[PDB]
Amino acid sequence: AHWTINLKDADIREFIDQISEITGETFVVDPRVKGQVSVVSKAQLSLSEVYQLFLSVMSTHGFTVVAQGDQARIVPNRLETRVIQVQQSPVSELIPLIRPLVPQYGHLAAVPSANALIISDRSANIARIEDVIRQLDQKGSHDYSVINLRYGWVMDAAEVLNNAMSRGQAKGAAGAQVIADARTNRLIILGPPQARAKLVQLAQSLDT
Amino acid sequence: AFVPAAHWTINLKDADIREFIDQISEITGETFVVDPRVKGQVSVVSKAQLSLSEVYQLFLSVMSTHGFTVVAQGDQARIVPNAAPDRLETRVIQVQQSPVSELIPLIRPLVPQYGHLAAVPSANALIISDRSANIARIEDVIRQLDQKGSHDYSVINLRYGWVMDAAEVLNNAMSRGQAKGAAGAQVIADARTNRLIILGPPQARAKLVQLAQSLDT
Numbered sequence A: 001a002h003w004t005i006n007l008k009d010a011d012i013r014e015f016i017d018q019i020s021e022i023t024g025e026t027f028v029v030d031p032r033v034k035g036q037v038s039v040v041s042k043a044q045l046s047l048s049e050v051y052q053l054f055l056s057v058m059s060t061h062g063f064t065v066v067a068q069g070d071q072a073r074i075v076p077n078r079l080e081t082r083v084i085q086v087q088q089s090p091v092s093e094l095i096p097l098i099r100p101l102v103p104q105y106g107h108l109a110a111v112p113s114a115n116a117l118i119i120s121d122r123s124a125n126i127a128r129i130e131d132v133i134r135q136l137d138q139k140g141s142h143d144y145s146v147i148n149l150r151y152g153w154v155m156d157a158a159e160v161l162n163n164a165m166s167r168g169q170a171k172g173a174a175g176a177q178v179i180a181d182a183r184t185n186r187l188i189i190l191g192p193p194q195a196r197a198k199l200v201q202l203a204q205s206l207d208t
Numbered sequence B: 001a002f003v004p005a006a007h008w009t010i011n012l013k014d015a016d017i018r019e020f021i022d023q024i025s026e027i028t029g030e031t032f033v034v035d036p037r038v039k040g041q042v043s044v045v046s047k048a049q050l051s052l053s054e055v056y057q058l059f060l061s062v063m064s065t066h067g068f069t070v071v072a073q074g075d076q077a078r079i080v081p082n083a084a085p086d087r088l089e090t091r092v093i094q095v096q097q098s099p100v101s102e103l104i105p106l107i108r109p110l111v112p113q114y115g116h117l118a119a120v121p122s123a124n125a126l127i128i129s130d131r132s133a134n135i136a137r138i139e140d141v142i143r144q145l146d147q148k149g150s151h152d153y154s155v156i157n158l159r160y161g162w163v164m165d166a167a168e169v170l171n172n173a174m175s176r177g178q179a180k181g182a183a184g185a186q187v188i189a190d191a192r193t194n195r196l197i198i199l200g201p202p203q204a205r206a207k208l209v210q211l212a213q214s215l216d217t
């Protein structure tokens, strides 16, 4: 009924065979399919959720799965694919907030039935995104503010704002959180109302 | 057909998707094998002139709109079904003053789940897929949003209130002069998630955010 997985530096063809053994689905794999994969889920996944993870891994490495009666065809169109369990926030709400941190070479997908996220990126950027998810995770909804920077640079702005909050220089902002969205040079500011409203003012003061 | 404008324009209405694929092959020189299951009627429109690479982006948006994708199968490119109303138009909307990426989160609440929305940053254009009457309505929203100097925004997830009521009260109060301090700010309802998107200059936006919180008490 449920499965976990810990596959490290395995041929993508082994991962396909392991999905066939788990799900019972048989695949006809195009000769051009190739690559090394690392796939991890410490969370228990249902048969349907294992299939969603399979699609995310295929998409991560540039492969499409096409219906073909009974069997399905795998065809072309180091990264680890990890399943991250979210405890309190709805996963579909966190997706847009985490997408900025995922590079264009990566993958990000929701698994709403397990309240989990699937991410593909280098192992070190996943661990950094895991900490962001852990800080975001909460029962209440995330109201937020977006600031499109005109003069400053978001990775610098995010570091200054984080440093000021950690050192006690951002009085009133304690508890607020900032997510840098480097693709569009914008900041996403979260947190409880008073703290969030103050961090928006500090961020705005920085882009003058 | 694609009409020279090397740039082109296009205004294809109610054509077989297979005709649209053949036209893309004639312009791009790319040869495709179309899986027997690929079917449908398409309307594709660009009054803006598109380069060769932008015509290819429009092609991908049309394929994705109708549930198709391009794969490599047996030494050739194959268009296949990937894992909605009968009449969908795919229109390119050029944006004049604002960077297109900044308008995308403000117009996404208006694109339904069957639709499509993609950026074409090299032409500063948006590709939208929807019913022709719905696209015209979104084109007016883009024209109004594009005249604004800032596209910074605040999001409020309403826990108690109904989204459409809150938006109407806030708009009425701003139009009647009752939202002191928030004049100049604007509201976009996002029903799918029962949330408000508040825009405007910083202080007015900060005041409309406070006013919006009083309606969800």
Ligand SMILES: [Mg+2]
Pocket (backbone or CB within 6 Å): A013, A016, A017, A029
């Ligand atoms: Mg095999």
